[PDB]
Amino acid sequence: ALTCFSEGAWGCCPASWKSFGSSCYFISSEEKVWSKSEQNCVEMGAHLVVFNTEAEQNFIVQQLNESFSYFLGLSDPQGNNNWQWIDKTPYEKNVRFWHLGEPNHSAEQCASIVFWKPTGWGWNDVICETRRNSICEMNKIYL
Ligand SMILES: OC[C@H]1O[C@H](O[C@@H]2[C@@H](O[C@@H]3[C@H](O)[C@@H](OC[C@H]4O[C@@H](O)[C@@H](O)[C@@H](O[C@H]5O[C@H](CO)[C@@H](O)[C@H](O)[C@@H]5O[C@H]5O[C@H](CO)[C@@H](O)[C@H](O)[C@@H]5O[C@H]5O[C@H](CO)[C@@H](O)[C@H](O)[C@@H]5O)[C@@H]4O)O[C@H](CO)[C@H]3O)O[C@H](CO)[C@@H](O)[C@@H]2O)[C@@H](O)[C@@H](O)[C@@H]1O
Ligand SMILES: [Ca+2]
Ligand SMILES: [Ca+2]
Ligand code: NA
């Protein structure tokens, strides 16, 4: 089942997915390692989330549980601080919302969004083989 909204054409998302902008989003409450999280999003036709604007992140974090961290579509494969987005958008020309003091270790090659007060939601690099929740993102279905 799809839930469709008018585009002023229709923008459709799977019924259990949250809608925003030109993308659909799914918040996976099952804890997996990063590579298994990406494969789970790929099995639904999506990828791990790629943050393109601040507004996209503000919508997403309203759906999250503050007591958990969520894997993002951002990784450092060679541990050389060369962060790459899962959909090959340029990391240098894109938004970056790292927490104060992050990233902070080349061995932490995967990016996660987490709630650290007083700052709140922000990115943190973590070990990829740690099991955490994740966020998937696919484009809207236009009919
Ligand atoms: O773990 C078992 C018990 O842990 C807790 O016990 C209490 C805990 O108190 C701490 C500290 O007082 C303090 O820590 C601040 C920082 O201090 C530094 O000296 C250093 O130790 C930091 O440790 C980081 O780096 C080491 C690398 O060796 C990691 O092993 C460690 O997990 C930590 O890395 C995390 O945090 C950094 C930010 O500093 C991130 O950049 C990393 O990516 C990583 O993030 C993960 O962890 C955080 C939180 O754990 C999580 O939110 C993320 O999502 C990632 O999963 C150290 O951080 O302050 C903190 C907070 O104010 C405080 O909790 O340890 C004391 C002994 O060390 C102990 O006496 C305390 O009781 C507590 O959870 C117990 O219930 C557990 O049994
Ligand atoms: Ca996006
Ligand atoms: Ca870190
Ligand atoms: Na890192």
Residue numbers in the entry: 63 to 70, 75 to 209
What does the paper behind this entry write?
The dectin-2 polypeptide contains an extracellular C-terminal C-type carbohydrate-recognition domain (CRD)3 linked to a transmembrane domain and a short N-terminal cytoplasmic domain. Insight into the function of dectin-2 is provided by the demonstration that, although the receptor lacks obvious signaling motifs in the cytoplasmic domain, at the cell surface it is associated with the common Fc receptor γ subunit (FcRγ), which contains an immunotyrosine activation motif that interacts with Syk kinase, initiating signaling that leads to secretion of a range of cytokines. Microbial targets include Candida albicans and other fungi, bacteria such as Klebsiella pneumoniae and Mycobacterium tuberculosis, schistosome egg antigen, as well as dust mites.
The molecular replacement solution revealed that there was one monomer in the asymmetric unit, and difference Fourier maps showed two branches of the Man9GlcNAc2 carbohydrate cross-linking two protein molecules related by a 2-fold symmetry axis. Specifically, the density is strong for seven mannose residues and is fitted well by the Manα1–2Manα1–2Manα1–3(Manα1–2Manα1–3 Manα1–6)Man portion of the oligosaccharide, comprising branches D1 and D2. The carbohydrate was therefore modeled as two symmetry-related molecules each at 50% occupancy. As a result of the orientation being fixed by the interactions with Trp-182 in dectin-2, the mannose residue at the non-reducing terminus occupies a secondary bind site, making hydrogen bonds with Arg-198 as well as contacts with Trp-182 and Val-192. The overall fold of the dectin-2 polypeptide is closely similar to that observed for other C-type CRDs, particularly those from mincle and BDCA-2. Many CRDs, including those in mincle and BDCA-2, bind an auxiliary Ca2+ near the conserved site. However, although several of the amino acid side chains that form ligands for this accessory Ca2+ are present in dectin-2, in the crystals dectin-2 has a Na+ at this site.
